Design a protein around this ligand. Structure first.
Ligand code: ZN
Ligand code: ZN
Ligand code: ZN
Ligand code: ZN
Lengths: 217, 217
């Protein structure tokens, strides 16, 4: 039964009822692994079962959970995850799933991971799985990028607005964008939005460049 | 008549009706000088007249305006202000004003300025005026500190809360104090207040140490 806190958070995070990711539960999962409440092995096995959920949304969401722990939980997770069998499993998985949305997300992760651990000795079964998949006829998504954990960038300072370069005065003062951490004038940071991946659910101040980029990805 | 924008801002800032400083008008005065809308000479002369206001509040407020331009407007103001006569004037001024609140504020500024320009060749008529005032029997306020302009400190990063040292997690994330720029956990920055000297009138997040220090000074 719900028993471990981890399992309740995974149920929550992979629930077909959510219309957008449940970042709060996903961030809780990352902390539980990082703090040793649950082992990388047990987490990954529970994740696999959710990957095999008959629901397309639950199945794809579990892939998002997977992307997050690989990104936020370090070597303990990387070693559990990127093995020969698992990379091959990832392969058969994406090749036989009835949901294309699921297959596309897995293809993207394989490639993201191939480039992320490109300079790492320990991992490469990933780079090859892509070789075989790119050789087997599978087409990969557009590349976007190692990766940095889900954490708000540090906040820079400066004497001019990063975007428009206007010089700050005592009246036209600086403001930080919560997504990139740079300083901007108020007119270049007049919009706001949530940054749930950084644990921020409320709408906070962001710069124009970030508001545009967030609107895309 | 109100004619120059500067004069309207000085009237506003030294108005006996204000119960707390009018930081927005004071910051406007600093920008007007910095941007050359008004010369250091004309500003200082208009300030002197307000220093000689028969109202104790207007008179003391004009001293606050003076502290601000010396602090936020650099050498153009320092040279206009710290001359032999002006330092001597400051002296006779504080010695003959009917309001003690006015005399105390001037004594504090003289000392602040003596220590602020302590390593500057150009200024010293200030250090001596204090000599004479400390030699003439006048007692000076408690020392608190050059000085840094009214501008929000840069925002540091870190992996532990600056105050309590708790380790940030994905759920117990960082927050910056708007007064000192350090990162803290939410429980060490659960209070807020305005920072009108930085041009921030609304109540913003501050750390416990700053909330205590702001409550004093
Ligand atoms: Zn700008
Ligand atoms: Zn930004
Ligand atoms: Zn703390
Ligand atoms: Zn602080």
């Amino acid at each position: 039964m719900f028993r471990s806190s981890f399992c309740k958070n995974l149920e929550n995070a992979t629930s077909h009822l959510r219309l957008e990711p449940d970042w709060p539960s996903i961030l809780l999962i990352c902390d539980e692994i990082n703090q040793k409440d649950v082992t990388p092995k047990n987490a990954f096995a529970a994740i696999k079962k959710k990957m095999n959920s008959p629901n397309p949304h639950s199945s794809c969401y579990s892939l998002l959970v997977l992307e997050s722990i690989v990104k936020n939980c370090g070597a303990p997770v990387h070693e559990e995850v990127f093995t020969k069998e698992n990379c091959e499993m990832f392969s058969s998985f994406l090749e036989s799933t009835p949901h294309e949305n699921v297959r596309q997300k897995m293809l993207e992760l394989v490639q993201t991971w191939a480039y992320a651990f490109r300079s790492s000795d320990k991992y490469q079964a990933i780079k090859d799985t892509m070789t075989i998949l790119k050789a087997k006829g599978h087409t990969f998504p557009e590349l976007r990028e190692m990766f940095t954990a889900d954490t708000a960038p540090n906040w820079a300072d400066g004497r001019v607005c990063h975007r428009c370069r206007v010089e700050f005065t005592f009246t036209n003062r600086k403001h930080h964008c919560r997504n990139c951490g740079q300083v901007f004038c108020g007119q270049c940071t007049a919009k706001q939005c949530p940054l749930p991946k950084y644990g921020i659910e409320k709408e906070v101040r962001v710069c124009d460049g970030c508001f545009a980029a967030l609107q895309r990805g």
